Design a protein around this ligand. Structure first.
Ligand SMILES: [Cl-]
Ligand SMILES: [Cl-]
Ligand SMILES: [Cl-]
Ligand SMILES: [Mg+2]
Ligand SMILES: [Mg+2]
Ligand code: NA
Length: 327
DNA sequence: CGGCGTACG
DNA sequence: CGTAC
DNA sequence: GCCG
């Protein structure tokens, strides 16, 4: 009744089991902070199953037969159904480890391994990190300086303004080039932690060398607070606000038009949706999927796709619009 | 038990 | 090591 | 942690 891969089922942005999925996602996050990738994936997948259900889970029997619910995930749900709280989840939430790893990994430039090393050195607060800049990269320095703004949700209102500004620079860098909104906003989210754009040009090959030209133009307009031949840029942008401005994370990616469907699919996400789709591709269909293409390793050939619809058809999956990829 | 997505900066 | 979905 |  419920297929086992998230790419086999529609997952809307808002759903009927918000509280249950949020709890499982706490345990998933905590597993990641400990390096337990398998447990992170199971808890993420169990959470996603609940997002795909057509109505609220009210009784434990409704978990019977659902993929990715075993003893542990089912006990979490049972406790939430019976008591409104799961003791394990609440213990994680208030733990010094969870709170500090979350605070540290939320920094742009800091991943689990860096956060964990700082944790073991006894560091606990952003001010702890500011006092020891000897230990910070230029990227991490930027992430820490801008941390407060970057912690403030980006709004869909902000996105339209940013896109016009990116389009202006893109059009000077390469007339005819296009800018497409991707990531969470393309899936219908009303706010986000960053804004994701995919850039291409209708004439194959004309996109070569494009992103340095775009970045130089944005920098000359005073709009770049931070950035690093390249085709992906992870920037911090200066975004107007009434009488002031705020820093916003923006990701720019260039793809040749031949690869655009694959890049659009990949950069539209969700992150879990894409991992599940690539796992499905490889394990169920024997095809290797990434944001550049879809490879048949028996015939040693790449599938040509003109659309995301083509890619779903290639993989034998019913098409899901971006708004239903919120796994 | 093995597997757990796959890229670029 | 970090980044992205 | 769960699937196959
Ligand atoms: Cl694990
Ligand atoms: Cl300004
Ligand atoms: Cl990729
Ligand atoms: Mg995003
Ligand atoms: Mg992004
Ligand atoms: Na980070």
């Amino acid at each position: 009744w419920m297929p086992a891969y998230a790419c086999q089922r529609p997952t809307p942005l808002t759903h009927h089991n918000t509280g249950l999925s949020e709890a499982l996602e706490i345990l998933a996050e905590a597993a990641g902070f400990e390096g337990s990738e398998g447990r992170l994936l199971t808890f993420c997948r169990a959470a996603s199953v609940l997002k795909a259900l057509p109505s609220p889970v009210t009784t434990l029997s409704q978990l019977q037969g659902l993929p990715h619910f075993g003893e542990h995930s089912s006990r979490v749900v049972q406790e939430l159904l019976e008591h409104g709280v799961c003791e394990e989840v609440e213990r994680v939430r208030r733990s010094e480890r969870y709170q500090t790893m979350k605070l540290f990994t939320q920094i742009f430039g800091v991943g689990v391994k860096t956060a964990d090393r700082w944790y073991r050195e006894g560091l606990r607060t952003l001010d702890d990190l500011r006092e020891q800049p000897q230990k910070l990269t230029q990227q991490q320095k930027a992430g820490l300086q801008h941390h407060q703004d970057l912690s403030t949700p980006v709004l869909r209102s902000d996105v339209d303004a940013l896109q016009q500004v990116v389009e202006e620079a893109v059009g000077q860098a390469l007339p005819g080039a296009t800018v497409t909104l991707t990531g969470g906003f393309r899936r219908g989210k009303l706010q986000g932690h960053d804004v994701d754009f995919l850039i291409t040009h209708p004439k194959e090959g004309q996109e070569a060398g494009l992103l340095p030209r775009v970045m130089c133009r944005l920098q000359d307009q005073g709009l770049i607070l931070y950035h690093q031949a390249f085709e992906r840029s992870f920037c911090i942008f200066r975004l107007p606000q009434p009488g002031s401005w705020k820093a916003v994370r923006v990701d720019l990616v260039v793809a040749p038009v031949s690869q655009f469907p694959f890049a659009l699919l990949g950069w539209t996400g969700s992150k879990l949706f894409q991992r599940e789709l690539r796992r499905f591709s490889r394990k169920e269909k024997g095809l290797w999927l990434n944001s550049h293409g879809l490879f048949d390793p028996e015939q040693k050939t790449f599938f040509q796709a003109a659309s995301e619809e083509d890619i779903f058809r290639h993989l034998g999956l019913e098409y899901l619009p971006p708004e239903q990829r919120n796994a």
